Amino acid sequence: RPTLPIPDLLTTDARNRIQLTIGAGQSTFGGKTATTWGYNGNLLGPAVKLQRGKAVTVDIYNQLTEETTLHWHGLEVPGEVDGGPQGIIPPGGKRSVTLNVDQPAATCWFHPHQHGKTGRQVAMGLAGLVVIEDDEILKLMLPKQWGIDDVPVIVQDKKFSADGQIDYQLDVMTAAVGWFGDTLLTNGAIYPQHAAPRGWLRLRLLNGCNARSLNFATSDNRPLYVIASDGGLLPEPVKVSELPVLMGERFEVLVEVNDNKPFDLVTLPVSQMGMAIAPFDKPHPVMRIQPIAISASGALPDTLSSLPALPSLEGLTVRKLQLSMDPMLDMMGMQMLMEKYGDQAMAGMDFHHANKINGQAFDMNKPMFAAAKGQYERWVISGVGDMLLHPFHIHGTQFRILSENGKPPAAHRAGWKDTVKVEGNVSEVLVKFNHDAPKEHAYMAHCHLLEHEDTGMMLGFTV
Ligand SMILES: [Cu+2]
Ligand SMILES: [Cu+2]
Question: Which residues does the UniProt record annotate as the domain Plastocyanin-like?
Fold first, then answer.
């Protein structure tokens, strides 16, 4: 097996600048070349290291022949640097942003947000990581040797045509059920191995799929200890036997490594339409962990952080967001899925503006509302009316889940989140925006099933 590719950990230079070049190159999958896009390389991207309380300037050079944007998913930053669809970077041009980092330690990520094309641009290879550090986390003495006992694990599916190229289409079927493939990548490699020292191994897990939900576990059923969600540390570790991860979500887990006992990180079949077709009808390996007989220094502390109680809900502004899909698109798309793949597409379970929030397909010129700055609001997001999965993401914040799809959140999901599950039911989140966003650079709120976002399931809002 190939070794797990380890993204470079990138910090500022003497001018306080980080350079990111967006460009086309080539990658090899199963022996066959494909055109791919990457940040500072051919595919995927570096891990940008940020420090709470410090500002960094990022110089972003678009060397593609089409327009793109660069969005920092999970970062609490003003709209002007948020890199939503209004944050255009012309082909052959450059945009610079200054990020004033003001949130706790977390694994965030970055990716394109081009209007109507975010799914294609992510599918072509663009994604990178953000590692935010703070003073609190350093004192815990977690595993922290990058590429050794602290590793990022970006998991993505793709499908390829016979000629070896990535086979991306936004069409009636994918607008309805999402773009998904038959090949699983881990930091861009197929089923890599990672050598790890005896003791604790920290995995920063990102579901970077367009549409496919994941469910992590180990091949020999050793537990995962969840220590962090999208927005940072949980108050205490939470032991789990499996870990569902929606599109765009991150979790950090610790797992024990013992001499002479290799095991695989795997993903278990999910109950999502289209996602349990071979090879994903069965547990699917993500990466092999190969124990090395050298002692690892990291700890799993009993206490990680302090999590504040939920405040009172009385008096808070309520904003209701009703997700919907044109009945026609939903029917046509699902029929096409069933015709192609049959019953296995439900195992365990104009289209360009067909998906909507509050009856409206995304209008970039018309933010739907102006949210308060520095005030808690309660946002109620409903998927009642269809049975599709909508991981709902809100820019400019780390929120607390009050109810996830009609039930209180599980413990590992009760901390700081930027995504909430919505699937045929109603979710409620407690959100606060610390930064402004004007109409010309609005925050987005949308489904992170990228084909739904690109066909209208997104709104802009100001702060
Ligand atoms: Cu985001
Ligand atoms: Cu959706």
Answer: 25-135, 197-262, 350-463
